[PDB]
Amino acid sequence: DDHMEFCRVCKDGGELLCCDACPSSYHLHCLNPPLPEIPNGEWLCPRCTCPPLKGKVQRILHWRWTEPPAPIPEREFFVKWAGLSYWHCSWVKELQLELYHTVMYRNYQRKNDMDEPPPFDYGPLYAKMEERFYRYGIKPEWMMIHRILNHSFDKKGDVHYLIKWKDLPYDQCTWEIDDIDIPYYDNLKQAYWG
Ligand SMILES: [Zn+2]
Ligand SMILES: [Zn+2]
């Protein structure tokens, strides 16, 4: 059960600080934020400290820069979650992706530039729907309801509906929450029940 004899971030050896939960080892200048020096007691590495993901990510859409944590800028990615529709597209931390979706993460890496974010895809509440969604690569039909196919009740009992989304094949239907203001949503709910 040895540790890495080289900093994970910079691949070089020397003064190393080793995680007590995993064999990772880092150079204090390499971590973000950098640490003053060797801390007292246990120390868990940035990949051991990393929080788990809310679900499983289906597709990475976009990435952005963010403000450095409080003592180098980190990075967040706009993700499409597997099983949930584009209304649930969230932002996740770069190291979350590498830890839990490595091959997918590195596949994205190989294709694009990771110094400058990709350009926005421009081709009522549209001006905002363009803000959270459309510019990142979400074709606006993918957030429009085509059909309500079925309903379901969970442990708590909040009803879920299985929605077929427009210009998105049935294989990517999605169980959606009751309390979300989709355009038209409750009008199709009444059609389904009535
Ligand atoms: Zn660790
Ligand atoms: Zn290093």
Curated annotation (Swiss-Prot):
Region (Histone-binding): 1-194
Zn finger (PHD-type) start-end: 4-51
Subcellular localization: Nucleus; Chromosome
Domain Chromo, chain residue ranges per copy: 72-120, 143-194
Tissues and organs where the protein is expressed, per its UniProt entry: Preferentially expressed in total brain, fetal brain, and cerebellum. It is also moderately expressed in the adrenal gland and detected in testis.
Disease linkage: Defects in CHD5 may be a cause of the development of cancers from epithelial, neural and hematopoietic origin. CHD5 is one of the missing genes in the del(1p36), a deletion which is extremely common in this type of cancers. A decrease of its expression, results in increased susceptibility of cells to Ras-mediated transformation in vitro and in vivo.
Quaternary structure and partners: Component of the nucleosome remodeling and deacetylase (NuRD) repressor complex, composed of core proteins MTA1, MTA2, MTA3, RBBP4, RBBP7, HDAC1, HDAC2, MBD2, MBD3, and peripherally associated proteins CDK2AP1, CDK2AP2, GATAD2A, GATAD2B, CHD3, CHD4 and CHD5. The exact stoichiometry of the NuRD complex is unknown, and some subunits such as MBD2 and MBD3, GATAD2A and GATAD2B, and CHD3, CHD4 and CHD5 define mutually exclusive NuRD complexes. Interacts with HDAC2.
Role according to the record: ATP-dependent chromatin-remodeling factor that binds DNA through histones and regulates gene transcription. May specifically recognize and bind trimethylated 'Lys-27' (H3K27me3) and non-methylated 'Lys-4' of histone H3. Acts as a component of the histone deacetylase NuRD complex which participates in the remodeling of chromatin. Plays a role in the development of the nervous system by activating the expression of genes promoting neuron terminal differentiation.
Family in the record: Belongs to the SNF2/RAD54 helicase family.
Entry text on domains: The PHD domains mediate specific binding to histone H3 unmethylated at 'Lys-4' and may preferentially recruit the protein to transcriptionally inactive genes.
Protein name: Chromodomain-helicase-DNA-binding protein 5
Organism expressing this protein natively: Homo sapiens (Human)
Lineage, highest ranks first: Eukaryota, Metazoa, Chordata, Craniata, Vertebrata
Underlying gene: CHD5
